[PDB]
Design a protein around this motif. Sequence first.
Motif, mmCIF file in Angstrom:
data_model
loop_
_atom_site.group_PDB
_atom_site.id
_atom_site.type_symbol
_atom_site.label_atom_id
_atom_site.label_comp_id
_atom_site.label_asym_id
_atom_site.label_seq_id
_atom_site.Cartn_x
_atom_site.Cartn_y
_atom_site.Cartn_z
ATOM 1 N N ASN A 11 0.819 -1.206 0.000
ATOM 2 C CA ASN A 11 0.000 0.000 0.000
ATOM 3 C C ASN A 11 0.857 1.261 0.000
ATOM 4 O O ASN A 11 0.443 2.291 -0.543
ATOM 5 N N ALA A 12 2.063 1.193 0.570
ATOM 6 C CA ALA A 12 2.998 2.313 0.498
ATOM 7 C C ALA A 12 3.496 2.526 -0.930
ATOM 8 O O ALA A 12 3.719 3.665 -1.356
ATOM 9 N N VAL A 21 5.734 10.227 -6.952
ATOM 10 C CA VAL A 21 7.139 9.859 -6.735
ATOM 11 C C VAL A 21 7.660 9.132 -7.971
ATOM 12 O O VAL A 21 6.922 8.312 -8.557
ATOM 13 N N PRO A 22 8.873 9.434 -8.451
ATOM 14 C CA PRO A 22 9.407 8.753 -9.643
ATOM 15 C C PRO A 22 9.582 7.248 -9.456
ATOM 16 O O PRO A 22 9.787 6.756 -8.343
ATOM 17 N N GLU A 23 9.480 6.523 -10.578
ATOM 18 C CA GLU A 23 9.399 5.063 -10.575
ATOM 19 C C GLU A 23 10.662 4.365 -10.089
ATOM 20 O O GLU A 23 10.610 3.163 -9.814
ATOM 21 N N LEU A 29 11.887 -1.246 -4.494
ATOM 22 C CA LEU A 29 11.069 -2.220 -3.713
ATOM 23 C C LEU A 29 11.642 -2.420 -2.306
ATOM 24 O O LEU A 29 11.600 -3.558 -1.800
ATOM 25 N N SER A 30 12.144 -1.349 -1.686
ATOM 26 C CA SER A 30 12.620 -1.464 -0.285
ATOM 27 C C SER A 30 11.573 -0.801 0.607
ATOM 28 O O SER A 30 11.455 0.434 0.538
ATOM 29 N N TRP A 32 11.436 -0.219 3.840
ATOM 30 C CA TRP A 32 11.978 0.732 4.845
ATOM 31 C C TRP A 32 12.319 2.064 4.167
ATOM 32 O O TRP A 32 11.887 3.116 4.686
ATOM 33 N N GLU A 33 13.000 2.016 3.018
ATOM 34 C CA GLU A 33 13.348 3.248 2.258
ATOM 35 C C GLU A 33 12.067 3.906 1.738
ATOM 36 O O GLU A 33 11.965 5.147 1.822
ATOM 37 N N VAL A 34 11.112 3.099 1.264
ATOM 38 C CA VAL A 34 9.851 3.646 0.679
ATOM 39 C C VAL A 34 9.108 4.442 1.757
ATOM 40 O O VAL A 34 8.631 5.548 1.444
ATOM 41 N N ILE A 35 9.048 3.913 2.984
ATOM 42 C CA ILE A 35 8.315 4.599 4.090
ATOM 43 C C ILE A 35 8.987 5.937 4.415
ATOM 44 O O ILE A 35 8.265 6.923 4.629
ATOM 45 N N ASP A 36 10.322 5.962 4.431
ATOM 46 C CA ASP A 36 11.046 7.222 4.744
ATOM 47 C C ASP A 36 10.693 8.260 3.674
ATOM 48 O O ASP A 36 10.377 9.407 4.049
ATOM 49 N N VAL A 37 10.692 7.851 2.401
ATOM 50 C CA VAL A 37 10.329 8.780 1.291
ATOM 51 C C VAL A 37 8.860 9.205 1.416
ATOM 52 O O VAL A 37 8.583 10.403 1.238
#
Length: 44
Positions: A11-12, A21-23, A29-30, A32-37
């Motif tokens: 869902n993130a 957000v750019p592709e 597909l991380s 932890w990194e996706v949530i920070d962004v």
Amino acid sequence: DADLRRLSLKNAKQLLRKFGVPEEEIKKLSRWEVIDVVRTMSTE
DNA sequence: CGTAGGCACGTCTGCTCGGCTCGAGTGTTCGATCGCGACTGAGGA
């Protein structure tokens, strides 16, 4: 932040797609990194 | 008649006291990281 961690990768990823957000960041597909962004995108 | 011995101001001298500034010194608060345990998705048995 804890709510974003619960959000799960699926869902993130869809939320990062919704904000424009750019592709590349969606692609790494991380979760932890996706949530920070996504937290930074929400703050903006 | 003259002629030298006592009363008011002016400005300075010196000491005392109270007040104000100002910086050194000391204690108190609060954000800024550091570390620990834990959360939570993730590629191999």
